[PDB]
Amino acid sequence: KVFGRCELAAAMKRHGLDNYRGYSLGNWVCAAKFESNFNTQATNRNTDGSTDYGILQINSRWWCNDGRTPGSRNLCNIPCSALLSSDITASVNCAKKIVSDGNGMNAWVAWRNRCKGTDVQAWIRGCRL
Ligand SMILES: [Cl-]
Ligand SMILES: [Cl-]
């Protein structure tokens, strides 16, 4: 599923992400835009052989099992394929574990490089939430 901007903001707001660990909703929408272009089916292979999955590009070397990332951890206890659902619940629940692990949203390279320190509230402006 390719989300609309406001559609995803509402969905994320309705999975508890607004101000989760202090990150306002716009941060999450911004990260999703640049990680996956709002596409729940996005996958990208990393040089170390891991793969990033889903609208927040959650990485198989730590967070999900895809059966092909040797010696990886599955800190979220999900198959990575669960992260490609049109239902973002699994991605959101796993993202909450990631953002809580000490490095905040800096775990998302696109967030640090394209969202951090920008006017992220612009990503939810015009949405009725
Ligand atoms: Cl915001
Ligand atoms: Cl933080």
Tab-separated table of all heavy atoms in Angstrom, residues 12 17 20-32 35 56 95 98-113 115-116:
chain	number	residue	atom	x	y	z
A	12	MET	N	-0.511	6.671	11.964
A	12	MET	CA	0.539	6.663	12.979
A	12	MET	C	0.039	7.278	14.266
A	12	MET	O	0.363	6.792	15.356
A	12	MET	CB	1.765	7.415	12.482
A	12	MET	CG	2.578	6.630	11.484
A	12	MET	SD	3.842	7.718	10.816
A	12	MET	CE	4.994	6.516	10.182
A	17	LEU	N	2.195	6.998	17.918
A	17	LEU	CA	3.511	7.558	17.634
A	17	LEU	C	3.628	9.050	17.877
A	17	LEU	O	4.751	9.564	17.944
A	17	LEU	CB	3.861	7.256	16.186
A	17	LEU	CG	4.363	5.850	15.970
A	17	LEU	CD1	4.736	5.700	14.495
A	17	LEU	CD2	5.583	5.504	16.792
A	20	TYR	N	5.779	10.000	20.717
A	20	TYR	CA	6.359	8.821	21.341
A	20	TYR	C	7.845	9.051	21.582
A	20	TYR	O	8.603	9.383	20.658
A	20	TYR	CB	6.147	7.585	20.486
A	20	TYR	CG	6.568	6.329	21.190
A	20	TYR	CD1	5.697	5.667	22.053
A	20	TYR	CD2	7.830	5.790	20.993
A	20	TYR	CE1	6.078	4.512	22.697
A	20	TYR	CE2	8.210	4.643	21.624
A	20	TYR	CZ	7.337	4.009	22.472
A	20	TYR	OH	7.736	2.871	23.117
A	21	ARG	N	8.267	8.861	22.823
A	21	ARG	CA	9.626	9.178	23.239
A	21	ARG	C	10.025	10.589	22.829
A	21	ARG	O	11.208	10.876	22.581
A	21	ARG	CB	10.611	8.148	22.695
A	21	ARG	CG	10.475	6.775	23.330
A	21	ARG	CD	11.141	6.702	24.696
A	21	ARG	NE	12.579	6.970	24.578
A	21	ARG	CZ	13.508	6.442	25.373
A	21	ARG	NH1	13.138	5.577	26.312
A	21	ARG	NH2	14.801	6.738	25.213
A	22	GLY	N	9.049	11.488	22.745
A	22	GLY	CA	9.321	12.880	22.482
A	22	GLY	C	9.373	13.295	21.038
A	22	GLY	O	9.650	14.464	20.769
A	23	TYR	N	9.116	12.388	20.103
A	23	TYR	CA	9.180	12.681	18.679
A	23	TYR	C	7.786	12.995	18.167
A	23	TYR	O	6.932	12.112	18.124
A	23	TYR	CB	9.796	11.501	17.929
A	23	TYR	CG	11.243	11.362	18.214
A	23	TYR	CD1	11.693	10.543	19.218
A	23	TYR	CD2	12.161	12.084	17.486
A	23	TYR	CE1	13.044	10.444	19.516
A	23	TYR	CE2	13.511	11.989	17.745
A	23	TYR	CZ	13.957	11.157	18.756
A	23	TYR	OH	15.322	11.082	18.985
A	24	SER	N	7.575	14.238	17.749
A	24	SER	CA	6.268	14.627	17.261
A	24	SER	C	5.935	13.880	15.974
A	24	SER	O	6.822	13.434	15.227
A	24	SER	CB	6.221	16.108	16.968
A	24	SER	OG	7.099	16.402	15.901
A	25	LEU	N	4.635	13.811	15.687
A	25	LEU	CA	4.170	13.050	14.537
A	25	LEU	C	4.905	13.416	13.259
A	25	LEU	O	5.139	12.552	12.393
A	25	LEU	CB	2.674	13.276	14.370
A	25	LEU	CG	1.910	12.311	13.511
A	25	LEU	CD1	2.071	10.930	14.025
A	25	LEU	CD2	0.443	12.698	13.515
A	26	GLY	N	5.225	14.693	13.066
A	26	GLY	CA	5.833	15.081	11.805
A	26	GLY	C	7.155	14.379	11.557
A	26	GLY	O	7.538	14.142	10.408
A	27	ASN	N	7.898	14.099	12.622
A	27	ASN	CA	9.157	13.367	12.489
A	27	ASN	C	8.927	12.002	11.859
A	27	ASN	O	9.712	11.556	11.024
A	27	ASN	CB	9.798	13.188	13.861
A	27	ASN	CG	10.432	14.439	14.355
A	27	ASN	OD1	11.493	14.818	13.900
A	27	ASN	ND2	9.745	15.125	15.265
A	28	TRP	N	7.904	11.290	12.334
A	28	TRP	CA	7.618	9.943	11.846
A	28	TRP	C	7.157	9.975	10.400
A	28	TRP	O	7.571	9.133	9.589
A	28	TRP	CB	6.567	9.267	12.770
A	28	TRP	CG	7.051	9.102	14.158
A	28	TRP	CD1	6.764	9.893	15.233
A	28	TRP	CD2	7.956	8.095	14.624
A	28	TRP	NE1	7.428	9.428	16.349
A	28	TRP	CE2	8.150	8.312	16.005
A	28	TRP	CE3	8.574	6.991	14.018
A	28	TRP	CZ2	8.968	7.485	16.773
A	28	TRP	CZ3	9.382	6.195	14.776
A	28	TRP	CH2	9.580	6.444	16.138
A	29	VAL	N	6.290	10.928	10.049
A	29	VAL	CA	5.855	11.031	8.661
A	29	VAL	C	7.036	11.370	7.755
A	29	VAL	O	7.165	10.831	6.650
A	29	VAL	CB	4.719	12.066	8.551
A	29	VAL	CG1	4.305	12.275	7.125
A	29	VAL	CG2	3.564	11.609	9.443
A	30	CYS	N	7.889	12.296	8.189
A	30	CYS	CA	9.059	12.675	7.421
A	30	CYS	C	9.964	11.479	7.212
A	30	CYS	O	10.466	11.262	6.109
A	30	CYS	CB	9.805	13.806	8.138
A	30	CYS	SG	11.174	14.431	7.231
A	31	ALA	N	10.209	10.713	8.269
A	31	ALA	CA	11.083	9.548	8.147
A	31	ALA	C	10.499	8.554	7.160
A	31	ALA	O	11.202	8.053	6.281
A	31	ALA	CB	11.286	8.884	9.502
A	32	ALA	N	9.195	8.273	7.275
A	32	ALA	CA	8.547	7.362	6.345
A	32	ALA	C	8.639	7.868	4.910
A	32	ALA	O	8.853	7.075	3.987
A	32	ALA	CB	7.082	7.149	6.752
A	35	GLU	N	12.338	7.302	3.881
A	35	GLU	CA	12.796	5.922	3.942
A	35	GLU	C	12.145	5.079	2.856
A	35	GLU	O	12.813	4.261	2.229
A	35	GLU	CB	12.491	5.331	5.309
A	35	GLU	CG	13.346	5.854	6.431
A	35	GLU	CD	14.778	5.384	6.360
A	35	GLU	OE1	15.073	4.466	5.549
A	35	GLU	OE2	15.624	5.949	7.103
A	56	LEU	N	9.099	2.039	7.285
A	56	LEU	CA	10.194	2.630	8.065
A	56	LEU	C	11.530	1.892	7.897
A	56	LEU	O	12.499	2.140	8.637
A	56	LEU	CB	9.836	2.691	9.550
A	56	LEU	CG	8.776	3.777	9.874
A	56	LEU	CD1	8.174	3.538	11.242
A	56	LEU	CD2	9.351	5.192	9.742
A	95	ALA	N	9.092	-0.133	15.463
A	95	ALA	CA	9.717	1.182	15.531
A	95	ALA	C	9.758	1.698	16.961
A	95	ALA	O	10.685	2.412	17.349
A	95	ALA	CB	8.962	2.180	14.650
A	98	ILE	N	12.736	0.250	18.559
A	98	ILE	CA	13.961	0.832	18.026
A	98	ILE	C	14.221	2.206	18.628
A	98	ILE	O	15.336	2.512	19.043
A	98	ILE	CB	13.891	0.907	16.494
A	98	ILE	CG1	13.701	-0.496	15.898
A	98	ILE	CG2	15.129	1.613	15.928
A	98	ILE	CD1	13.513	-0.473	14.381
A	99	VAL	N	13.207	3.062	18.644
A	99	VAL	CA	13.419	4.448	19.039
A	99	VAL	C	13.682	4.522	20.529
A	99	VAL	O	14.229	5.518	21.015
A	99	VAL	CB	12.208	5.314	18.622
A	99	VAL	CG1	11.005	5.077	19.503
A	99	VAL	CG2	12.596	6.797	18.573
A	100	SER	N	13.316	3.468	21.264
A	100	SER	CA	13.517	3.392	22.704
A	100	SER	C	14.888	2.847	23.074
A	100	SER	O	15.236	2.835	24.256
A	100	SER	CB	12.434	2.519	23.332
A	100	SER	OG	11.148	3.057	23.089
A	101	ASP	N	15.688	2.411	22.110
A	101	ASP	CA	16.893	1.665	22.458
A	101	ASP	C	18.086	2.541	22.804
A	101	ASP	O	19.153	1.991	23.107
A	101	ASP	CB	17.282	0.709	21.330
A	101	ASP	CG	18.064	1.388	20.213
A	101	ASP	OD1	18.213	2.635	20.200
A	101	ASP	OD2	18.525	0.664	19.312
A	102	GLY	N	17.949	3.870	22.749
A	102	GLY	CA	18.956	4.792	23.252
A	102	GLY	C	19.373	5.848	22.251
A	102	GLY	O	19.764	6.954	22.649
A	103	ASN	N	19.285	5.537	20.965
A	103	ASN	CA	19.685	6.458	19.918
A	103	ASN	C	18.530	7.192	19.282
A	103	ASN	O	18.755	8.002	18.370
A	103	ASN	CB	20.481	5.710	18.871
A	103	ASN	CG	21.645	4.952	19.465
A	103	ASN	OD1	22.503	5.546	20.116
A	103	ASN	ND2	21.626	3.628	19.340
A	104	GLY	N	17.334	7.030	19.817
A	104	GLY	CA	16.226	7.790	19.300
A	104	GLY	C	16.050	7.532	17.831
A	104	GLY	O	16.265	6.423	17.331
A	105	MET	N	15.663	8.580	17.120
A	105	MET	CA	15.329	8.449	15.705
A	105	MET	C	16.569	8.471	14.833
A	105	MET	O	16.464	8.296	13.617
A	105	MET	CB	14.362	9.568	15.331
A	105	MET	CG	12.944	9.127	15.699
A	105	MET	SD	11.642	10.021	14.879
A	105	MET	CE	11.503	9.196	13.384
A	106	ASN	N	17.748	8.700	15.417
A	106	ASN	CA	18.998	8.628	14.659
A	106	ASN	C	19.258	7.248	14.080
A	106	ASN	O	20.092	7.130	13.176
A	106	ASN	CB	20.162	9.017	15.545
A	106	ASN	CG	20.096	10.462	15.990
A	106	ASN	OD1	20.204	11.380	15.184
A	106	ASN	ND2	19.817	10.668	17.249
A	107	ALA	N	18.528	6.221	14.539
A	107	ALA	CA	18.571	4.908	13.898
A	107	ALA	C	18.113	4.938	12.446
A	107	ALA	O	18.440	4.024	11.682
A	107	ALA	CB	17.698	3.905	14.655
A	108	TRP	N	17.373	5.960	12.043
A	108	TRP	CA	16.862	6.080	10.683
A	108	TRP	C	17.745	7.088	9.973
A	108	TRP	O	17.699	8.281	10.266
A	108	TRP	CB	15.388	6.471	10.646
A	108	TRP	CG	14.509	5.326	10.983
A	108	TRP	CD1	14.117	4.302	10.138
A	108	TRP	CD2	13.932	5.034	12.249
A	108	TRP	NE1	13.329	3.424	10.805
A	108	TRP	CE2	13.180	3.850	12.101
A	108	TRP	CE3	13.936	5.685	13.487
A	108	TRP	CZ2	12.475	3.286	13.143
A	108	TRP	CZ3	13.237	5.116	14.534
A	108	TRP	CH2	12.494	3.932	14.353
A	109	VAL	N	18.572	6.605	9.040
A	109	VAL	CA	19.553	7.483	8.394
A	109	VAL	C	18.864	8.636	7.672
A	109	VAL	O	19.307	9.797	7.731
A	109	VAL	CB	20.438	6.668	7.430
A	109	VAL	CG1	21.435	7.593	6.730
A	109	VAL	CG2	21.198	5.604	8.191
A	110	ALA	N	17.730	8.348	7.041
A	110	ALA	CA	17.048	9.388	6.289
A	110	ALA	C	16.470	10.426	7.224
A	110	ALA	O	16.443	11.610	6.878
A	110	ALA	CB	15.952	8.802	5.409
A	111	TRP	N	16.039	10.008	8.415
A	111	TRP	CA	15.592	10.975	9.406
A	111	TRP	C	16.734	11.887	9.824
A	111	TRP	O	16.579	13.116	9.829
A	111	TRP	CB	14.971	10.292	10.622
A	111	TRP	CG	14.513	11.300	11.606
A	111	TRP	CD1	13.339	11.991	11.573
A	111	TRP	CD2	15.241	11.806	12.723
A	111	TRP	NE1	13.284	12.874	12.618
A	111	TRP	CE2	14.438	12.780	13.342
A	111	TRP	CE3	16.501	11.525	13.274
A	111	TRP	CZ2	14.841	13.459	14.483
A	111	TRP	CZ3	16.896	12.195	14.411
A	111	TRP	CH2	16.069	13.141	15.005
A	112	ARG	N	17.900	11.333	10.156
A	112	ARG	CA	18.960	12.231	10.593
A	112	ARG	C	19.315	13.210	9.489
A	112	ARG	O	19.618	14.379	9.735
A	112	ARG	CB	20.204	11.459	10.993
A	112	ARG	CG	20.136	10.307	11.878
A	112	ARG	CD	21.585	10.273	12.404
A	112	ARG	NE	22.601	10.089	11.325
A	112	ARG	CZ	22.856	8.890	10.788
A	112	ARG	NH1	22.140	7.934	11.288
A	112	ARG	NH2	23.727	8.559	9.804
A	113	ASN	N	19.326	12.714	8.247
A	113	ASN	CA	19.916	13.498	7.175
A	113	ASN	C	18.923	14.410	6.487
A	113	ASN	O	19.328	15.426	5.901
A	113	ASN	CB	20.590	12.618	6.110
A	113	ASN	CG	21.852	11.987	6.609
A	113	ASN	OD1	22.556	12.592	7.419
A	113	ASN	ND2	22.173	10.797	6.122
A	115	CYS	N	15.333	14.966	7.912
A	115	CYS	CA	14.247	15.425	8.767
A	115	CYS	C	14.746	16.177	9.985
A	115	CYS	O	14.185	17.216	10.338
A	115	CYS	CB	13.393	14.246	9.234
A	115	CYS	SG	12.731	13.328	7.848
A	116	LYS	N	15.737	15.626	10.666
A	116	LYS	CA	16.275	16.221	11.865
A	116	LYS	C	16.622	17.670	11.631
A	116	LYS	O	17.349	18.001	10.684
A	116	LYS	CB	17.513	15.445	12.282
A	116	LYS	CG	18.054	15.831	13.661
A	116	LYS	CD	19.247	14.926	13.944
A	116	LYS	CE	19.806	15.144	15.346
A	116	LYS	NZ	20.901	14.141	15.637
